[PDB]
Amino acid sequence: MNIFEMLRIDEGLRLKIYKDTEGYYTIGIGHLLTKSPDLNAAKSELDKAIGRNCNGVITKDEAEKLFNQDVDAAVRGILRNAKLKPVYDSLDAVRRCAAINQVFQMGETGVAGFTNSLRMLQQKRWDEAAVNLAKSRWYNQTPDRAKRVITTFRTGTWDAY
């Protein structure tokens, strides 16, 4: 198990434009296209991302390429973020996967909000962190997935997957 296998399980694979859990146009393995309610806006973003006129449909290969780019982007984002980088670097490899999973789903606009959780993670107070992480809109809106990620932070094992 690794971040690709983990996110494949959490995000699924869909080859035509669909709406994610927040109602946003998405494709492939959790590739967010746009927050716009206009489907034409999403189709444009898709063509731009893939570099051809897709008409809302892609291949598995294209889906895996976007997935690779998106994972790479999530990691680089963490490493460029002065708040996230020291916590990330303090973690073991399995817990680093949980961290990338979060950023992949949430982006990093929630950094200030998860300040207390992040401190507990860097302190390696795993049970306290896990309890704190569940006190979130994130947990309440996607509890099954959040439970899997939190368990991964708590244990440093792949037991939830």
- Residue ranges for the binding site for substrate? 32, 104, 117, 132
Q: How many CA atoms lie within 13 A of 39 on its CB side?
A: 7
Asked about 11 being catalytic, the answer comes back as yes
Q: With beta carbons less than 8 A apart as the criterion, state whether 70 and 4 touch.
A: no
Instruction: Name the minimum Å distance from CB 121 to Cl ion.
Output: 12
Kindly name the residue from 10, 11, 45, 70 that is annotated as catalytic: 11
Assess 117 for contact with Cl ion (CB under 5 A). Answer: no
Complex with Cl ion: residue 42 or 49, whichever CB lies closer:
49
Q: Identify which range of 70-78, 96-104, 131-139, 146-154 contacts Cl ion by CB under 5 A.
A: 131-139
Distance CA 33, CA 54 (A): 13
Q: How many CA atoms lie within 13 A of 44 on its CB side?
A: 8
Assess 152 for contact with Cl ion (CB under 5 A). Answer: no
Question: After which residues does the chain show a gap where C to N exceeds 2.5 Å?
Answer: none
Asked about 47 being catalytic, the answer comes back as no
Assess 49 for contact with Cl ion (CB under 5 A). Answer: yes
Complex with Cl ion: residue 94 or 131, whichever CB lies closer:
131
| Residues near 155 by beta carbon (within 8 Å), at least 6 away in sequence | 126
Q: What residues from 132 to 151 belong to the interface with Cl ion (CB under 5 A)?
A: 132
Instruction: Name the minimum Å distance from CB 93 to Cl ion.
Output: 26
Q: What are the CA-CA distances from residue 146 to residues 21, 51, 139 (Å)? A: 13, 33, 5
Q: Give the H/E segment covering residue 17.
A: strand 14-19
Binding site residues, Cl ion, CB under 5 A: 49, 132
Write out the catalytic residue numbers. Answer: 11, 20
